[PDB]
């Protein structure tokens, strides 16, 4: 966690290049009280590539390495040969592309991107800045109130706002002026494409939830679907939402390998499974083909799980819901399963009509295993294959 | 449905002091005519969150709740202590927070989104007027001009058009001007990208129509397909587009679990499954295993569903289109069949060549089973399987 | 086709309403020079809705059908009533309510949303122009000169340019420069939103092949494939391009009914079916069932098709491409296959082992039976099982 | 690779008669220095399109083959006629056509797009600046600065900035600004369009698979796993991100057709399955089969893979990660397992329990093949079932 410490500090130097550069390009006054801050920020970056190759497409750091500046200020060059010192701005690519690394996961993608757009134009601002006042007429004016002009101007002209209180008077002030405006339309198109792109994004499941909803609806509208059913159908996808994000359990599960799957249903199924009167004894491979073979099913408030006199070849596992077992007549209640219960047990080694009759009193949410793949699974463990046959 | 007129209030209580706050900091008269509407605005404020916990990430309740002002105008605090009021403008979070919750599956979220973007627009114009107004020179006019000027030029700066009648002429001005710029530059970056998002997501099935039926007809075109065949396909996918919005019967029920897609399938199918010759008197479970493998299949106009002398093995049940049963050699009419009627029904018994050559009127959208699935079925269910056996 | 000639000519009375209307309400002159063409348009428009419900959400069209002009300007009513001859203005909505049910199908829906935001726009700027130079002061100009310099003042406020050249003089004119504003900021970014939407849907198969190239691609990267390897895979993924580009024929005819996809089966692979030794004399519904059951394989340049001394289960058609049929040792070239041949019949019939090698000129895009399919689909024909067993 | 040559030969010449022709028209001295240059490019316009016909939608080139210029600025023609040389600007068509076909593969299409729109761009800015140029008041002025002035303003006028030290001052000064505020408008709203385009699909992948992990750690959210497995399933997913940009190798090769698949599995699996003792000594065939038919299968650090005691089906062979061959109890190191190695041979020919407990390392990303494959492809080679049979 030390190359944290390293690489902010590595920000905050390039940040101060990106500052004082310009500055003391435009007011040559400003080096001797900064030189020691010069020279310990040209000496870290001397280091920094040597820690950059310990503990790890090259130019840029090699070319903000050497110090082309402290010379330019101090043998007092011309303007043509004095904007070398620009090229110590380099670092900044290699700023980026370290911090689009060491926050890749913690941040949204997008936002990184917008954020890192934001502070290179606001940068780029300064420069544009300070290229304006050194192209302008000289005029015995503060400092600081002829950088607020240059700036004001600046900001005017790339938010493609343009009062045009402040505008060109030579033709180097218009051709660079026509730069600046090309360059700000460009960066303000970069702005809105990085912001839209933000927000389409932004509510994909609930969108996608709000089509699968609209698409029902009119089929049924197509079919002429009576509004009770609708109003039931429309009470799920709702519940769905409120629960889950309206995500279907198998297509999420396939996106796990063999060893993970079954590791989560092991951990949902493991004692509902276990506390089974026919399968107690039984090994822990049989368990876990069972653990794996589990389908979930969610039955609506009022929905028929099992009816009385059915053949009915299917056992239930409860996980969420609460039930209600009841008569053929559904006059007595036999009684109330909630979580960690079963029903449904007397089918997978007999195939004789039901004892009762299942309703559920919410959402139930519960697991079904049918007497398919359990007549299948059974073939490879004939020891319970037995003790089913003679429980039979 | 009490809470909402709460909610209403509270809204309505926010977008006072949201108004208010600003206009009285510019104008510290509006503080004796007002008082008694702030003070029971106060008090609903502090009253809300008892009611917020009551039939239901804090912090702005809680520092919206105390009053930081009727102190701050009743003292009369200097400027960097009176801007202490606004505090009470983070109830806008919370109102938000409500609404978008309040209204998440009524609205459109995109739209929501824009909506409440628009007004928090507007709320800050105000304010950024309010703030404009209270840095300028000291002037005698009426109070109703000075507010129209400086909401002129926010609305004129937030805006990007930038007239530039109005313009900074003191440093704090041209500082002020130069926040407003950006924020002025964000704000309608995220209108814009609000509205491209709200536009993208606005004809998905016609889109996914229009490129199903590109893709179609271009791999037509590769496989040199006849302009008779192009023409039926694309008078199919244009029936289909003007009854189901393009959308296949099967991937729209695979979006629902079995009971509701049993309800579906029984409430599409079941007078026309019941009254068979062949199924008649049957149980209701043989009925619904029926009723959940009808696979269907829409038939254009003049194409042939059965023709005379091939073996046979399906059933066919009419739900939507018309039909002509016709002869051999396609002379005699033997009849016309509608909705609620089948044909075939020869075939689940017996496979014996056909017995007549079946046409379509315009698009059927019938049903079909095959002599598979009704085999494959009719393994569990013995009784019947012998009274078709003694049929045949 | 007479309705075209009906809706043509009421959008150009009410583009002539449009045009009109708020050009009298600033000139109250032009009223009687045009009034046999405002007859002539009052009648058109009371006549229209008796034939919108011959040959076939109402509102707008009861309300611009009632003359509510023709008295604002006979009676000379003051500025307050005279705006209720605008109403006449909601007709657009019915009007653009046909015209994109009328070309919904030929025209991308975006880009007719695009041109009708386009068209409201400029008719919205003729109409604010005319607002503008209503509350002005009144001036000795030339009409033409005040209204180009009112839609020269609009132009420059809804495209956000802002010269600043034309400005507000007056309160009125500033709240109606405000108002204009938001509303110049709200079509402005509905056109970038149309824009951005119109070009994101451009080249969505290019896009989508890109991407599944990269994705291979990258995935053989990770598993360290010769660049051989990954040379014939880039090189088919280009011809798949340049031949459909790239899709699939599988995906492309699961998205027809059976019917339909049986005739193109048939068209596409009947002469090359039918004229086979093995299946010549045999009926068509068990030519149909071949048909049905050919699988689309493309080999590429210098591929092994079938290599000599395997055993070999498969027959293949060629469709598109050439074959050389070569020795074991592949010095000798027996043949040259192309279009409407197959190879390989000698494998549906006996298990034996193959008698030469198949090599593939060019991409050959070739179907392929296996004889898995073939024996299960012939134990429902068993007179030609019969023919094979004899021949085996 | 010599036509690569004539097409930008042809773009410099057609970006010539773009920049001269407009320039000429506003300065009618432009004619004799570059008459040479004229007459040069118009033989090769008039020679290009022989050579179009030549190795392999057609006005424009005979639109700008033939010499419309040459006579207009020879006889002098006044400003109506003179607008005729403009016609050979319709090359820049066929050139972007030619642009967009010979690099639509190198450079992704919404790049080369937004530069082809950008070029097109500064085309018609210097097109509309010699526009405004020709409409100005006749002044003595040097015409490097009256084209800087026009460029200026139409830049200024195209970005929407508008500072408005320029503007119109004749009423075809006015229309004519009209126009460029229409089409900068236009030209600024596709420029933005471009961008949010090429924006939204630049990290496809990553966002894929961000959507991934958060659907799957809500998923476990609501049903309550703890936070040891979501960590081990965390760590999974971004090791999927390091190592194949979360890609399953199963969706990867379905992307392919038999041929390559065959390839690409044999490259991958070739030496590792043939120096199995089982299988040597065995066909090709059989070896394909195989090849054809092992699963991918990651397991994460410190899972099990075999556990001692088990019955055990299955045979693993190791592609990428290390293993760890252990006692029952866990204490004593058996060996361990790298690259090109296998485990748990003794399966596919005996069902016997499992000899050792086989343990990852880190992350394996190993092949493995079920006993039900391989019994059902043994039953086509019944030598090696043999050798199988009597080995068992
Ligand atoms: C890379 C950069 C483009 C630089 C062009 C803008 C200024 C031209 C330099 C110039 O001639 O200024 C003359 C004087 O030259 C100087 O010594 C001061 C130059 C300051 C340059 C400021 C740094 C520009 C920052 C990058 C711009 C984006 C006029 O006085
Ligand atoms: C968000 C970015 C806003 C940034 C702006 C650049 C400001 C730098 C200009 C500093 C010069 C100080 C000046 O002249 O104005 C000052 C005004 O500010 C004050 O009120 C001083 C307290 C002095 O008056
Ligand atoms: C949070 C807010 C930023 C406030 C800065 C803009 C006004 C500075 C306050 C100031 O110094 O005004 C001085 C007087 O101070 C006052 O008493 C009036 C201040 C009114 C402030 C209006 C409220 C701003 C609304 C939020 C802006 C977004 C100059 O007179
Ligand atoms: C959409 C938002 C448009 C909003 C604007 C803010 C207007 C508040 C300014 C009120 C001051 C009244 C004023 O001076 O102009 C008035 C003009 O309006 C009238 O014509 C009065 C009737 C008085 O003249
Ligand atoms: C709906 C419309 C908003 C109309 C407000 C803009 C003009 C106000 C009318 C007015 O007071 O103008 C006074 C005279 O009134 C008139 O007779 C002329 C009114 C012309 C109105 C032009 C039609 C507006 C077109 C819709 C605008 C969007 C001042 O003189
Ligand atoms: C694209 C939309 C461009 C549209 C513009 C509205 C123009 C209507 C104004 C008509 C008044 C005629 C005028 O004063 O300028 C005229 C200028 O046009 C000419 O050169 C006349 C030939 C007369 O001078
Ligand atoms: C297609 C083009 C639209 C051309 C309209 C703009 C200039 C009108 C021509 C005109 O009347 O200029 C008069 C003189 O005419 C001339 O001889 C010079 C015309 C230069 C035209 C420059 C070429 C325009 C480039 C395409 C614009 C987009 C006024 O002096
Ligand atoms: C990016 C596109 C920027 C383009 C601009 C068009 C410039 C063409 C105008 C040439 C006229 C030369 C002129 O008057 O300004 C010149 C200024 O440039 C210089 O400093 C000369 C060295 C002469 O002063
Ligand atoms: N007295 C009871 N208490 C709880 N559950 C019961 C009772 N009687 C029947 N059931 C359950 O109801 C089911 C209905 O018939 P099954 O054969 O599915 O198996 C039955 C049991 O799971
Ligand atoms: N006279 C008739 N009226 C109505 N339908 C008939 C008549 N004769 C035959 N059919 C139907 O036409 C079908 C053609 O042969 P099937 O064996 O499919 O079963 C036949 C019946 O469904
Ligand atoms: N002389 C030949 N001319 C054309 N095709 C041949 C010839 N000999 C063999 N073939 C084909 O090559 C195939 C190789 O063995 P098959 O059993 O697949 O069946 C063979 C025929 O389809
Ligand atoms: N001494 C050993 N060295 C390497 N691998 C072993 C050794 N003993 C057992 N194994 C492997 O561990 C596996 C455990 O039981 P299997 O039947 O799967 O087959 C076994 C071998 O693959």
Redesign the interface.
């Known amino acids: 966690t030390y190359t944290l410490v390293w690489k902010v500090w590595i920000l905050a130097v390039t940040l101060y290049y990106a500052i004082r550069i310009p500055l003391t390009l435009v007011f040559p006054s400003l080096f001797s009280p900064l030189l020691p801050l010069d020279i310990l920020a040209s000496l870290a970056l001397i280091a920094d590539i040597p820690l950059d190759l310990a503990f790890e497409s090259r130019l840029p750091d090699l070319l903000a390495a050497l110090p082309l500046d402290l010379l330019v200020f101090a043998l007092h060059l011309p303007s043509p040969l004095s904007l070398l010192s620009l090229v110590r701005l380099l670092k900044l690519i290699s700023v980026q592309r370290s911090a689009t690394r060491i926050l890749?996961?913690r941040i949204?993608?997008?936002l990184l991107?917008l954020l890192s757009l934001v502070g290179f134009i606001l940068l780029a601002a300064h420069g544009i800045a300070c290229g304006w006042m050194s192209l302008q007429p000289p005029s015995e004016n503060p400092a600081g109130?002829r950088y607020?002009?240059a700036?004001?101007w600046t900001?005017?002209?790339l938010?493609?706002?343009?009062?045009?209180?402040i505008?060109?008077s030579t033709?180097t002030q218009?051709?660079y002026?026509?730069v600046i405006?090309?360059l700000?339309?460009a960066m303000?198109?970069?702005?809105?494409?990085?912001?839209?792109?933000?927000?389409?994004?932004?509510?994909?499941?609930?969108?996608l939830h709000?089509?699968?909803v609209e698409?029902?609806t009119?089929?049924?509208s197509?079919?002429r679907?009576?509004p009770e059913?609708q109003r039931?159908?429309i009470e799920?996808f709702?519940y769905l939402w409120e629960?889950?994000?309206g995500?279907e359990?198998r297509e999420?599960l396939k996106?796990?390998?063999?060893?993970?799957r079954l590791?989560?249903a092991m951990?949902?199924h493991g004692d509902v499974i276990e506390k089974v009167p026919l399968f107690k004894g039984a090994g822990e491979?049989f368990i876990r083909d069972i653990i794996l073979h589990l389908e979930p099913?969610?039955?609506?408030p009022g929905?028929?799980i099992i009816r009385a006199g059915?053949?009915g070849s299917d056992v239930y596992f409860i996980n969420r819901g609460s039930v209600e077992v009841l008569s053929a007549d559904e006059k007595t209640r036999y009684a109330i399963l909630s979580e960690g219960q079963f029903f449904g047990e007397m089918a997978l080694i007999l195939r004789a009509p039901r004892t009762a009759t299942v309703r559920a009193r919410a959402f139930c949410d519960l697991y079904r295993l049918d007497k398919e793949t359990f007549d299948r699974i059974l073939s490879?463990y004939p020891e319970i294959a037995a003790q089913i046959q003679e429980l039979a």
């Open positions: 890749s996961y949204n993608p997008a991107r109130t607020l002009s700036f004001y900001i005017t002209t938010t493609t706002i343009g009062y045009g209180d505008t060109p033709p218009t051709v002026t026509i405006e090309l700000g339309a303000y198109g970069l702005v809105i494409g990085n912001i839209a792109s933000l927000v389409s994004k932004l509510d994909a499941a609930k969108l709000r089509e699968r698409r029902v009119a089929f049924l197509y079919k679907i009576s059913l039931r159908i799920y709702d629960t889950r994000r995500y359990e999420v996106e796990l390998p063999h060893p993970l590791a989560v951990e949902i491979e099913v969610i039955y609506g929905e028929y059915e053949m490879r």
